[PDB]
């Protein structure tokens, strides 16, 4: 969502690279981190 | 069909650059280069963005038009022809070269095809 | 000849159950001229004279079944087109000519207080200042009456021979009676 400025929720929410892209991931709809 | 044997060449793998380059080179001077190979051909990795640029030849359509060929055949059309001008010789110099698909006379097959091949 | 075709009979409606207007169409079998194939090399149109008597005054189903009637001797009765079907016909516009941007092309003209002022018919404008001279956009008094018109969802209702002729579902053959009609039911949707 935040497109710009993502940084680790749940004590897990991972750091993944898709299309060089960095989009938050972690066992929660409440983390759908993306930029 | 069958023709001379003047400029007897082909293509495949090589670098879709200097490739044509000389093609003309002798494309100039005053020679006819009939080869072929298209597909086999070759050119920059980064396929992806690879097939992009020339899709930039793809839908580059300007009311006034702007076809942009859709078979290896071309790819080399452009390019090459690129090497030359557009006054007489040059021109002619574009009829004097000729290539084709598989083989009529004794990564370079994806962008095309891709955008038309 | 890949298809089937003839000319405009005319229109009239009448009967049915609710009632419905169509159009008549003339055409037995206008013979069979060669047939489409690009075999061994370039093949398309031959001509083993067998035509009319005057004609030298000027001297894979569709096409296939053809082979059926085009080898029979030439002609080929029209009508698979049967009971309740959708071919498509391509009339010839209509010598309507060169007209004002009025009907030629939908547009509102000279309003009121000036919708008369011995004023009237005439488009509004072309192009702005900076943009650049002109566009190939805005049509013009683009003549009409001659277009190779046609359409779609062309449903045929019925037919009978006494004279090989066809009854149609809604006319709009484009061109006028005694006119050049060609039909087909192309990529039908009602299928």
């Amino acid at each position: 969502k935040v497109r710009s400025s993502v940084k680790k929720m749940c004590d897990n929410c991972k750091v993944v690279r898709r299309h060089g892209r960095v989009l938050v991931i972690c066992s929660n709809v409440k983390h759908k981190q993306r930029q | 069909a069958e023709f001379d044997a003047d400029v007897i060449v082909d293509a495949r793998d090589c670098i879709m650059g200097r490739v044509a380059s000389q093609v003309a080179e002798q494309a100039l001077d005053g020679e006819t280069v009939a080869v072929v190979n298209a597909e086999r051909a070759v050119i920059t990795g980064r396929e992806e963005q690879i097939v992009e640029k020339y899709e930039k030849r793809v839908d580059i359509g300007n009311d006034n038009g702007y076809f942009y060929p859709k078979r290896p055949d071309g790819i080399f059309k452009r390019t090459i022809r690129g090497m030359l001008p557009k006054k007489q010789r040059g021109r002619e110099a574009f009829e004097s070269v000729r290539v084709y698909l598989g083989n009529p006379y004794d990564t370079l097959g994806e962008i095309s095809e891709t955008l038309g091949a | 000849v890949q298809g089937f075709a003839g000319y405009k009979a005319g229109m009239t409606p009448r009967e049915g159950m609710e009632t419905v207007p169509v159009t008549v169409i003339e055409t037995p079998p206008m013979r069979a001229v060669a047939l489409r194939a690009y075999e061994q090399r370039p093949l398309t149109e031959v001509w083993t004279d067998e035509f009319h008597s005057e004609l030298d005054r000027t001297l894979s189903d569709r096409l296939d079944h053809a082979l059926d009637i085009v080898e029979d001797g030439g002609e080929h009765a029209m009508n698979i087109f049967r009971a309740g079907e959708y071919a498509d016909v391509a009339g010839v516009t209509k010598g309507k000519g060169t007209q004002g941007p009025v009907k030629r092309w939908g547009v509102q003209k000279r309003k009121g207080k000036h919708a008369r002022q011995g004023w009237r018919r005439r488009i509004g404008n072309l192009g702005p200042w900076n943009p650049s001279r002109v566009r190939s956009t805005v049509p013009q008094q683009g003549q009409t009456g001659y277009h190779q018109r046609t359409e779609l969802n062309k449903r045929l209702i019925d037919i009978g021979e006494g004279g090989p002729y066809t009854l149609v579902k809604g006319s709009v053959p484009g061109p006028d009676k005694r006119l050049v009609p060609f039909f087909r039911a192309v990529r039908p949707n009602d299928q």
Binding site: - | - | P13, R14, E18, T19
Partner: protein
């Protein structure tokens, strides 16, 4: 047929007389109120305050138009007049009673209610 401010009488008794035609009811564009159709107009004048009253925001439908209606029966029908009936959101009349005939129509587009009240439906 029948829009902007074309007027049309009553045949029911709702307590009206005549009504101006605002919008043709249906959805955007649309430019026409043809019997069966439903109109968004108001009172141009209504009896001595029956129940409606002059200048009353309203909803009425189509039943009388000299515009001539082509019956699927390749037939033709029209009237000496142009007017219709009020309604209760629920395509439901008010006029307790009818007046000049009308046309099958109605039925086809829902309204019986009047369909029969009508002295005669043509």
């Amino acid at each position: 047929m029948i829009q902007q401010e074309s007027r049309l009488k009553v045949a029911d008794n709702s307590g009206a007389r005549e009504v101006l035609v605002i919008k043709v009811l249906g959805g955007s564009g649309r430019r026409y109120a043809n019997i069966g159709d439903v109109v968004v107009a108001t009172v141009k004048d209504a009896t001595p305050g029956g129940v409606v009253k002059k200048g009353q925001v309203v909803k009425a439908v189509v039943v009388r138009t000299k515009r001539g209606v082509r019956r699927p029966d390749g037939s033709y029908i029209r009237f000496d007049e142009n007017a219709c009936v009020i309604i209760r959101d629920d395509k439901s009349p008010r006029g307790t009673r009818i007046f000049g005939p009308v046309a099958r129509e109605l039925r086809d587009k829902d309204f019986m209610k009047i369909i029969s009240l009508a002295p005669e439906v043509i």
